[PDB]
Amino acid sequence: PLESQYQVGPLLGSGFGSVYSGIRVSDNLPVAIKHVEKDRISDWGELPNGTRVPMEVVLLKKVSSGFSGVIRLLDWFERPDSFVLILERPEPVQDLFDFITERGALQEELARSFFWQVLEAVRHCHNCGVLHRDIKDENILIDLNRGELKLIDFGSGALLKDTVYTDFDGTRVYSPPEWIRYHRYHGRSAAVWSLGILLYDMVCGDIPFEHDEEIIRGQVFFRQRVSSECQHLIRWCLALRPSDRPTFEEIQNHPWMQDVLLPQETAEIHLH
Ligand SMILES: O=C1c2c(O)ccc(O)c2C(=O)c2c(O)ccc(O)c21
């Protein structure tokens, strides 16, 4: 059913897997086709109907209902040594790591719009019972035309829970001090930490911390001019003590978050 119903094109990256550009035949929706090999999956789950699948798929199904800032799972298949996922492919697109790498640090107005959309997308996941655990520039795609950000790689994700996590598969330089020191964290507050790393990156062109010692020390130096309110929000997300970090609500009610542009205006002003 698979090679009949879609048409493969160029590789796009790897790997989280190996992803090819693809076209649905039924109608020419761009799609992306991700192959994941059974032998590299450390982490499995089960769907409603009760089949044994990779967590990624569990997590993607939970979040793919309706619209949002997540790239949606349109379908999937099993093969003898691999699973294969069919995902949306917006067109044209660029990931935030490449975008930042090309244009350097981002004007506050642009960072505010982007950051807001990441916030909405993460709220959506938490809502659906999903925690991403690897929120970073390269897991965000920009739809250059509509100005809409989309989250992508759920392969380190987990079901959201209130219990304390003991495993972590995401990026180190994005991991919170509680993980570095004690090998334990909670979802929401670890996510806020990483959101804080992300926001620094947006406005400074680079991440704040490289080594464990700098993460655990939690002192943030700004290498770029950044308003006083943005520094405050960033420092707040990057508090050492989990309980001293903001909730999403508080981040979203922060002064620096006010009067966010809509996506379309963001694209006009900053992407056209
Ligand atoms: O690299 C992608 C990806 C992509 O490169 C282009 C369009 C896309 O739609 C995705 C995508 O949905 C995607 C994903 O869900 C997980 C890991 C990934 O590396 C990716």
Side-chain angles (χ1 to χ4, degrees):
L2 159 55
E3 279 115 320
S4 49
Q5 204 185 332
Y6 304 98
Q7 200 205 358
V8 190
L11 197 88
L12 305 176
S14 50
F16 75 75
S18 310
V19 178
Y20 301 74
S21 165
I23 310 285
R24 192 168 53 199
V25 301
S26 339
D27 46 328
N28 304 253
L29 303 318
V31 291
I33 305 168
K34 179 174 187 188
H35 297 66
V36 201
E37 255 198 73
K38 295 206 191 163
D39 320 61
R40 241 198 318 93
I41 310 168
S42 77
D43 212 316
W44 301 71
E46 198 182 331
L47 325 84
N49 52 262
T51 339
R52 183 224 178 29
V53 296
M55 195 57 83
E56 185 168 12
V57 181
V58 175
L59 296 187
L60 284 157
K61 256 160 65 70
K62 287 171 66 75
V63 297
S64 290
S65 279
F67 305 130
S68 34
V70 190
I71 260 160
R72 312 250 233 105
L73 183 60
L74 304 159
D75 201 354
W76 67 275
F77 306 87
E78 182 168 15
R79 280 163 158 191
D81 293 285
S82 70
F83 287 82
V84 170
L85 279 60
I86 304 301
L87 303 146
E88 295 184 293
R89 188 157 55 73
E91 202 35 52
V93 80
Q94 191 185 26
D95 86 30
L96 189 59
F97 176 96
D98 293 335
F99 184 92
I100 274 155
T101 298
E102 287 183 19
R103 312 198 172 187
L106 268 45
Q107 277 160 228
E108 292 192 35
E109 188 182 70
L110 182 54
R112 163 175 325 100
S113 156
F114 278 12
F115 194 63
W116 177 271
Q117 293 189 246
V118 174
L119 274 146
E120 294 291 306
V122 176
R123 293 179 52 200
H124 174 260
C125 295
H126 289 197
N127 261 258
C128 300
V130 178
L131 192 74
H132 188 284
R133 299 209 285 178
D134 198 25
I135 292 155
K136 64 171 167 186
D137 43 14
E138 62 182 285
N139 289 330
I140 297 160
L141 294 181
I142 309 155
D143 168 346
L144 280 357
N145 285 343
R146 303 183 169 288
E148 289 172 4
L149 262 61
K150 257 162 206 336
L151 262 49
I152 53 162
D153 176 12
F154 288 82
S156 338
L159 296 162
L160 180 61
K161 79 199 175 165
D162 296 301
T163 24
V164 57
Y165 291 84
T166 32
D167 78 300
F168 180 62
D169 240 275
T171 335
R172 196 151 174 101
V173 298
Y174 279 79
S175 67
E178 59 267 26
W179 166 250
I180 300 308
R181 305 178 44 79
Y182 305 140
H183 278 67
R184 53 211 278 110
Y185 60 100
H186 291 82
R188 288 178 210 87
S189 50
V192 162
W193 170 271
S194 67
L195 286 165
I197 304 287
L198 178 66
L199 172 52
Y200 177 98
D201 193 49
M202 275 187 283
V203 307
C204 282
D206 218 358
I207 59 182
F209 313 124
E210 167 93 316
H211 310 308
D212 294 358
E213 315 82 81
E214 301 167 305
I215 302 179
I216 282 158
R217 177 166 180 251
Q219 195 127 316
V220 179
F221 295 108
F222 286 89
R223 66 189 90 204
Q224 201 71 21
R225 152 70 190 198
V226 178
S227 66
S228 294
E229 323 227 291
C230 186
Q231 296 196 19
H232 177 274
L233 182 51
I234 282 166
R235 290 187 161 109
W236 187 17
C237 289
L238 294 185
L240 292 179
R241 282 168 53 227
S243 69
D244 289 332
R245 294 175 202 151
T247 54
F248 298 138
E249 173 169 24
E250 291 168 304
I251 292 174
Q252 287 206 281
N253 291 310
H254 185 279
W256 189 81
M257 293 290 255
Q258 295 321 304
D259 310 300
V260 67
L261 295 185
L262 294 165
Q264 209 62 244
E265 13 177 20
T266 300
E268 279 162 359
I269 296 181
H270 297 276
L271 307 173
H272 317 335

